[PDB]
Paper text:
Anion Exchanger 1 (AE1) is an elevator-type transporter that plays a key role in acid-base homeostasis of erythrocytes. AE1 mediates an electroneutral anion exchange by counter-transporting one Cl– ion against one HCO3– during its transport cycle. Human AE1 contains 911 residues which are divided into two domains: an N-terminal cytosolic domain (CD, residues 1–347) and a C-terminal transmembrane domain (TMD, residues 371–911), joined by a flexible linker (residues 348–370). Similar to other facilitated transporters from the SLC4 family, e.g., the human electrogenic Na+/HCO3– cotransporter 1 (NBCe1) and the fungal borate transporter Bor1, AE1 operates via an elevator mechanism, in which the transporter switches between the inward-facing (IF) and outward-facing (OF) states by an elevator-like motion of the TD relative to SD.
In contrast, in the identified IF2 state, it is fully ordered, with R730 interacting with the N-terminal end of TM3. In the OF state, TM10 is well-ordered, with R730 facing the extracellular space. This state was previously analyzed for the human AE1 and showed an organization similar to other SLC4 transporters (e.g., NBCe1 and the Na+-driven Cl–/HCO3– exchanger NDCBE). The analysis revealed that, in the OF state, R730 consistently forms direct contacts with the anions. In the OF state, K743 in this hairpin forms a salt bridge with the 4- or 5-phosphate groups in the PIP2 headgroup, resulting in its structural stability throughout the 1 µs simulation time. This contact needs to be broken before reaching the IF state, in which K743 and the lipid are separated by 20-30 Å.
Numbering used by the authors:
A (entry chain C), B (entry chain B): 371 to 743, 751 to 894
The structure:
């Protein structure tokens, strides 16, 4: 699959031939209750980050791109990717690095007196050209170089960032409405509370903890022995929706306490009508775009391409692992082409460019996964789940009355649950846990038995140092260099690590799949 | 040991003979960190209910019996019972039915124009006479008739009462300080808040949930593989103290929110100085005790003896079961005599009559229990744990500055945890769980393989009906007759059940111990 065919666009046609014959099976496998449960869960997990990043992006870019644009982009791109994608299980949405790049580009354009939206259009054109060139030469074959080392480092970092962001949101809620002896009861509540409120912080904390605990308990009940088998599994599949419903109703019955709720724009309207229209003009919105700027937009296009390529391809590698029991097969060349080309086309309309997200995609895959009598029996691989998630995200603007009832604390707890669950499949997390377990309690696995405990611990420590460096770079102002450090981890594995460690130990610890040799 | 020796006071002498030789080993066994952890845990578990019941009794008795009297009685009774008791594991304290009887007798006295404390003293005289007569006749042999049926029904009822009372106290906290849009800050803060306060109800809920969660997680931590062996066991033993410290610190660092704190009397004085003195004269403080009343106190004293004897003997049965691995052993005759005689002594001084609590006794047993790496390897039997707990309870007034820092929410969570852990060892709870499990998942136990599933479920349903009847009796104002209804289960087991169940089914279901049947 990843190997170069040697012919122009060979990988893309190979992926098409490999995946599209199973198109009828993709629709047929969707008709199941687990599919509906995954649809609801991933719909919430994709809608909430869309709104959060839309708000942040509208704040940073002066509403040039806002919540409505991001929601429409997510809906359209998800629909198209599910319909025509080699790996339908991936969920395309905005991520933190993209927001950082967008704000940096906005600041640069402000400094240089250029139109931000037109610069984005030209970056999108350059991205389309670059992705066409890459897919032509089967540049996705380079994904083979990315080892389990980099995959697990990236997944662990993403999960840690997710958990830390959830806790940071909780800290922000507490700081906005601190527990104080005296409050003011004339506080304006529009657009947001203008002062501290009583019971808001503790109520939000209680709601988040309750939803997290309910989701975890239902997850345990899924594989437990209580109740019949089929009914137990059916209830467990709907665990997250049930927890969300329980906590939403609990908050709803509480009427004298204020808690923040999901907010969606009234209608499908451009965020800043004065600043932009629905369709951007590449030549110029109000003034002539510079020739030098349109020619130099290639470099920002290169940075965005690195971001999207790294994220999407690593997500594809994680989801398509042999342990996941994926059998239909994913296409690296088709997925990258679709994602980057759609991002470039959206840039023309002024919508953001989206990339497959690690946590959303992993949660989508695990939600469809069915586990037989601690082993993954099968994964319900189909296109309808992601298609319906994208359709609902697009319809979220119309579903204002239902959405406004859901507190943000419930979703924060759900996101903590998502991070914790996504930490399961990483071997780096398992070795981090083994750091605490005494040696005798270590499991019987190829790397535990064939590696001296101290050497394996040194391996995990080096990975932890890499994670710490990546986190420091992410926090530092030059957060856009994170993809380059992630790439640099590959030379660390291929060159530096062999000097410290013997070949056999590297083979056991950094195995491609969960198998011996 | 239950069989009558044929000589008056033979059982008492046999018990003291059996228990005296280990006395030297009892003090030696106390030297271990587990002992200190159990001391702290049981100290909190005994102190908090003592204050609760003392305050409630003072409210009901117009200060004729308050917190100081209960604290002194509990302290002295614990010291004496630990010094001379056949079962040091039992924890002597005040339980609900004693409170109910005290209030009922107060109402009866007010109806008949009698002094409550003097009637209590005469009842104590009659109770001492009753216990002396019973021990003389070896009446403790009737305890052998108490089978697993009544024992487990009583334990399940007490644990359910613990959980229900904790949740009812939480509901009371939420009712006193409801979540409302607007509060008033002119509310007077002494003696207690005179109106709703912000963040108090939610903060109490959060503290209770946090302490319960930390206690459960530290329980899981002891049996898990994390951290070294000895270190992990040491942490696990101190689990409840550690959770209490964590939540107390969390509350302490929060400054602008009020949570009900532990209230210990400043000095050792009678609750109502004018009403009564330290020593109650039998003929009455204010008026002569009617001769007819001192003669009729035999009936209320008879009821009190029935109740206290039932509670203490059943608790001794629970603690001294063969599965508990109580190697040194204990005697029913001696501990009953000590408990009842000391209750009468307390009645003479005016303090109440204390009986060994079920949940506290079971929790002190479990705290001292040492489990091999799934089973009870042994149980530590020391006279120093109970003695130290009693000494600390007596020292509570002297430790007011630290004890006043402990919120009631932490102790409510600790009591919920205590009930939950008490539910562990009851086979009635196991069969209640089995009701939900499918037949294939049922464990390999004598009453599962030997007994048809539907007959076992019928047995469980009959026990549940008995529990429901006991609960209804406890709620209805006939709660004082609850021990009578509890003892009615013995005729049920010896008469009614054999009609429906073959002998083999009863042998399997109601096995006295975990042995071949
Ligand atoms: C605060 C950290 C905890 C103190 C760390 C201080 C360092 C430290 O205490 O390591 C001891 C242990 C080494 O093994 P060690 O020989 O000491 O003993 C092992 C185990 O700790 C128990 O003693 C026994 O298991 P069990 O339960 O009885 O069946 C068994 O000994 P035995 O049966 O043959 O007699 C052994 O399996 O290593 C760790 O467990 C990692 C702990 C976390 C390392 C640090 C994590 C950052
Ligand atoms: C709301 C209550 C639940 C619905 C009540 C309706 C419950 C009801 O109708 O009986 C079903 C079951 C009888 O077991 P039954 O032989 O029919 O089948 C079991 C189980 O139900 C699944 O069918 C299979 O488990 P899994 O797939 O391998 O995991 C397996 O069957 P199979 O392998 O041979 O195909 C068996 O384990 O009984 C209970 O579990 C008690 C539930 C609690 C009873 C109520 C307790 C008060
Ligand atoms: C088991 C946990 C229960 C306890 C909950 C914490 C209550 C503490 C409140 C202090 C008073 C206050 O309002 O402070 C809130 C404080 C600090 O804000 P500040 O005091 O204004 O200082 C900030 C100064 N600014 C205003 C200039 C920025 O924010 C916090 O990080 C509070 C901790 C919240 C996270 C708790 C997570 C618990 C885990 C849940 C997993 C399901
Ligand atoms: C471990 C979970 C324990 C949950 C225990 C909850 C106790 C409160 C029960 C509600 C009714 C009640 O107690 O009523 C109390 C009040 C009163 O209501 P009011 O109409 O203002 O009455 C006015 C006052 N009175 C009753 C004296 C006339 O209600 C409330 O506003 C409480 C807010 C609801 C909190 C629910 C939190 C649940 C979190 C669960 C996720 C972990
Ligand atoms: C909408 O955007 C304007 C900013 O103008 C747009 O962006 C510029 C970079 C440029 O491309 C213009 O042609 C676009 O129309 C926001 O209004 C600005 O407010 C700032 C201060 O916050 C002020 O310095 C600017 O002069 C304002 N610009 C204009 C054109 O009035 C406006 O707040 C945004 N929001 C909405 C709801 O319209
Ligand atoms: C004490 O008892 C007397 C007499 O019954 C009663 O009036 C008074 O309220 C009680 N309380 C105190 C604090 O003395």
């Amino acid at each position: 699959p990843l190997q170069q065919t040697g012919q122009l666009f060979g990988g893309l046609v190979r992926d098409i031939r490999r995946r599209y014959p199973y198109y009828l099976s993709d629709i047929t496998d969707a008709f199941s209750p687990q599919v509906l449960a995954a649809v609801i869960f991933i719909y919430f997990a994709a809608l909430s980050p869309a709104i959060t990043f839309g708000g942040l992006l509208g704040e940073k870019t002066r509403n040039q791109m806002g919540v409505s644009e991001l929601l429409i982009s997510t809906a359209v791109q998800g629909i198209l990717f599910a319909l025509l994608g080699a790996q339908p299980l991936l969920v395309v949405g905005f991520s933190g690095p993209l927001l950082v790049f967008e704000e940096a580009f906005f600041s640069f354009c402000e400094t240089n007196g250029l139109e931000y939206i037109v610069g984005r259009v030209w970056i999108g054109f350059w991205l389309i050209l670059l992705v066409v060139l890459v897919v032509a030469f089967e540049g996705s074959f380079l994904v083979r170089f990315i080892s389990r080392y980099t995959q697990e480092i990236f997944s662990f970092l993403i999960s840690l960032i997710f958990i830390y962001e959830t806790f940071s949101k909780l800290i922000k809620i507490f700081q906005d409405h601190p527990l104080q002896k005296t409050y003011n009861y004339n506080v304006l509540m529009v657009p947001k509370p203008q002062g501290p409120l009583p019971n808001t912080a503790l109520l939000s904390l209680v709601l988040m903890a309750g939803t997290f605990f309910f989701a975890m308990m239902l997850r345990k009940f899924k594989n437990s022995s209580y109740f019949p088998g089929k009914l137990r599994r059916v209830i467990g599949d709907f665990g997250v929706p049930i927890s969300i419903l329980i906590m939403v109703l609990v908050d709803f019955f509480i009427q004298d306490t204020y808690t923040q709720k999901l907010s969606v724009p009234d209608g499908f309207k451009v965020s800043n009508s004065s600043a932009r229209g629905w369709v951007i003009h590449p030549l110029g919105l109000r003034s002539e775009f510079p020739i030098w700027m349109m020619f130099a937009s290639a470099l920002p296009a290169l940075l965005v391409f690195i971001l999207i390529f790294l994220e999407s391809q690593i997500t594809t590698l994680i989801v398509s692992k042999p342990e996941r029991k994926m059998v239909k097969g994913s296409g690296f060349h088709l997925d990258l082409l679709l994602v980057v080309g759609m991002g470039g086309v959206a840039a023309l309309f002024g919508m953001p460019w989206l990339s497959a997200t690690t946590v959303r995609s992993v949660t989508h895959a695990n939600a469809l996964t069915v586990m037989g009598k601690a082993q993954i029996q099968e994964v319900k691989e189909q296109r309808i789940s992601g298609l319906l998630v994208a359709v609902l995200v697009g319809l979220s603007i119309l579903m204002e009355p239902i959405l406004s009832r859901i507190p943000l604390a419930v979703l924060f707890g759900i996101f903590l649950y998502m991070g914790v669950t996504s930490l399961s499949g990483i071997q780096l997390f398992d070795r981090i846990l083994l750091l605490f377990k005494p040696p005798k309690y270590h499991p019987d696995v190829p790397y535990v038995k064939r590696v001296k405990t101290w050497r394996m611990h040194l391996f995990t420590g080096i990975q932890i140092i890499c994670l710490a460096v990546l986190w420091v770079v992410k926090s530092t102002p030059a957060s856009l260099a994170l993809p380059f450090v992630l790439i640099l981890t590959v030379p660390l594995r291929r060159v530096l690590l062999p000097l410290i460690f013997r070949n056999v130990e590297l083979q056991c610890l950094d195995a491609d799949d969960a198998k011996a040799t």
